[PDB]
């Protein structure tokens, strides 16, 4: 019926897609996700938004998903919608592997998913996926990489970026203190801790609200790890000391 | 109709309506003052006002049929000098979806058309022109219909 239709795929008088604009505004509140590209690896740092004494620890992470032997991603937005897209990402990457018997390059995987999102914003009469993603991976064409995507279906490669809550401050800091082409995985980790420390105004880094995953190449095979509690706390303590020594 | 709304002003007319209801039927029955009421809308009237002890006989006044239209035109053309050619049946057939006021307008407009033309007595053509004038139909600048 025309009366009840919402018209989720039309243009505004000033040529704007309101449903996409609102969806992006929804991602603006979700947990902060951070990605930094280093010389010998990539990392993802995400604010573990859920924090409660009664929640149990299941799975290897809450917001970091493994897509391949050499790729991973983090999500910010509607959790249920993210699960739909992460499953599609896994299917796309395996379909490419079946066709070519070679792992899908990271850029191609991002484009395939972003094509799905773009279709939702053009035709169908459905609401767009209110999710924004960060991808990290390695391939033989461009080595370590970091990508971002939005509900509109638009993506771009970055050396360091953030999406979610206080993204503006996070990117403003990263822009100032990012040494392009001369960052190791260790300075990258330290930079992630400093950025997260100021971005999460509520409280400070407790080593429980932060999940960090790093991607590196060892002995010719990609390795994806989620840092454990002991090492995350160690990083925070070092950041506290350096902040003290500065003052 | 009475409704539970926070807007004032309507409550005063509701109080006047309650007084009218009591006067129509209530304590101290009245048997010497009758009442006639006319309304364009009955879907909005309060049930207590449309009751069977206050407004018993609800008479419906439908839009006139062909015969009714013919009679109305004759009634309002009684006093005018009309030629013995006017086919009031044809006028009734051609004035579908009209009311008595619109038929009166048809007759008076026929008279005015005759006056414009400078004619002593009306004619069927004048009546048709009056019907066209009263219909208030506008043209779309083109007539591509077959």
């Amino acid at each position: 019926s025309r009366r009840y239709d919402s018209r989720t795929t039309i243009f505004s008088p000033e040529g704007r897609l309101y449903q996409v604009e609102y969806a992006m505004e929804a991602i603006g509140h979700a947990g902060t996700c951070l990605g930094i590209l280093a010389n010998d690896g990539v990392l993802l740092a995400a604010e573990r938004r859920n924090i409660h004494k009664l929640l149990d620890e299941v799975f290897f992470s809450e917001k970091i998903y493994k897509l391949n032997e050499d790729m991973a991603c983090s999500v910010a937005g509607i959790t249920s919608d993210a699960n739909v897209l992460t499953n599609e990402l896994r299917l796309i990457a395996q379909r490419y592997l079946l066709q070519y018997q070679e792992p899908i390059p990271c850029e191609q995987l991002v484009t395939a998913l972003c094509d799905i999102k773009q279709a939702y914003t053009q035709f169908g009469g459905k609401r767009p996926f209110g999710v924004s993603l960060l991808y990290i991976g390695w391939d033989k064409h461009y080595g370590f990489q970091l990508y971002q995507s939005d509900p509109s279906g638009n993506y771009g490669g970055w050396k360091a970026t953030c999406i979610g809550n206080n993204s503006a401050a996070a990117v403003s800091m990263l822009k100032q203190d990012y040494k392009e082409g001369e960052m190791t995985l260790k300075s990258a980790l330290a930079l992630a801790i400093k950025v997260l420390n100021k971005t999460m105004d509520v409280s400070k880094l407790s080593a429980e609200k932060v999940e960090i995953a790093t991607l590196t190449r060892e002995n010719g095979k990609t390795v994806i790890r989620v840092l454990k509690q002991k090492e995350v706390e160690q990083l925070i303590k070092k950041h506290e000391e350096e902040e003290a020594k500065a003052e | 109709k009475r409704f539970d709304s926070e807007k004032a002003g309507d409550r005063e007319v509701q109080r006047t309506m309650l007084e009218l209801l009591n006067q129509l039927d209530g304590f101290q029955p009245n048997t010497q003052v009758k009442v006639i009421a006319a309304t364009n809308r009955v879907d909005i009237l309060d049930p207590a006002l449309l009751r069977s002890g206050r407004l018993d006989r609800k008479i419906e006044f439908p839009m006139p049929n062909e015969e009714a239209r013919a009679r109305i035109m004759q009634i309002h053309s009684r006093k005018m000098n009309v030629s013995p050619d006017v086919n009031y049946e044809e006028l009734a057939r051609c004035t579908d979806d009209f009311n008595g006021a619109q038929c009166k307008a048809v007759c008076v407009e026929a008279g005015m058309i005759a006056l414009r033309r400078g004619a002593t007595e009306l004619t069927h053509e004048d009546y048709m022109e009056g019907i066209l004038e009263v219909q208030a139909k506008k043209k779309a600048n083109l007539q591509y219909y077959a």
Partner: protein
């Protein structure tokens, strides 16, 4: 033919009001509780009928899904039946392919995907129901929650329904890592007792447990049994 447009749409501030209202319906629902003990899980709910005429044993709220998984809800009863049927269907489809009982986490993920589809599909409203799923796989107990939006969480103990804020605050004070299933059952009953507004009887509540033996709904004899203490 059926409307092809989504009824759930983003609001100016970025909220999905229809999902927000589905949670409000869940919130006004009947209280529910789930506690993950050291060697098992327990699910409990209030089953206060409107009058003596209703048959307490006619319809169950704690319905099994497989030999090792059971679930309870807080919200609309009719929507719960739909999800229970889909959950059983998904569990059997998994077993047919893999010749192994579906792990609790996997079943929750598949059930959640079903609820998510109703927040994006055309001409449907969200399931105004929240589910609690308990399981025992690989020698370990599991407790999950799945909301109208399609998101699921892993809990050590939680509550839903009316006054769930006080129910969770209660559970936080009383919870302990090394509890025992008997103490978990006792705590679960007390949690419900916090906001019950009447005398609790074996016919006015429902309980189920899951352990190495498997999920099974406790009989009214046992429910009265525990109530006495």
């Amino acid at each position: 033919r059926g409307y092809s447009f989504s009824l759930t749409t983003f609001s100016p501030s970025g909220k999905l009001v229809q999902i927000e209202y589905a949670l409000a319906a869940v919130a006004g629902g009947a209280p529910s509780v789930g506690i993950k003990a050291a060697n098992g899980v327990v699910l409990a709910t209030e089953k206060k009928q409107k009058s003596i005429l209703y048959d307490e044993r006619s319809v169950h709220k704690v319905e099994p899904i497989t030999k090792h998984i059971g679930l309870v809800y807080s919200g609309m009863g009719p929507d719960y039946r739909v999800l229970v049927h889909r959950a059983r269907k998904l569990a059997q489809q998994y077993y047919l392919v893999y010749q192994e009982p579906i792990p609790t986490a996997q079943l929750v993920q598949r059930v959640a995907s079903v609820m998510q589809e109703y927040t994006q599909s055309g001409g449907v409203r969200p399931f105004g129901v929240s589910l609690l799923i308990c399981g025992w796989n690989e020698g370990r107990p599991y407790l999950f929650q799945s909301d109208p939006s399609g998101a699921y969480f892993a809990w050590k103990a939680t509550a839903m329904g009316k006054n769930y804020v006080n129910g969770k605050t209660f559970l936080e004070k009383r919870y302990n890592e090394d509890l025992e299933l008997e103490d978990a059952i006792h705590t679960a009953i007390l949690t419900l007792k916090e906001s019950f507004e009447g005398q609790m009887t074996e016919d006015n509540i429902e309980v189920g447990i899951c352990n190495e033996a498997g999920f099974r709904r406790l009989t009214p004899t046992e429910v009265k049994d525990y109530l006495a203490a």
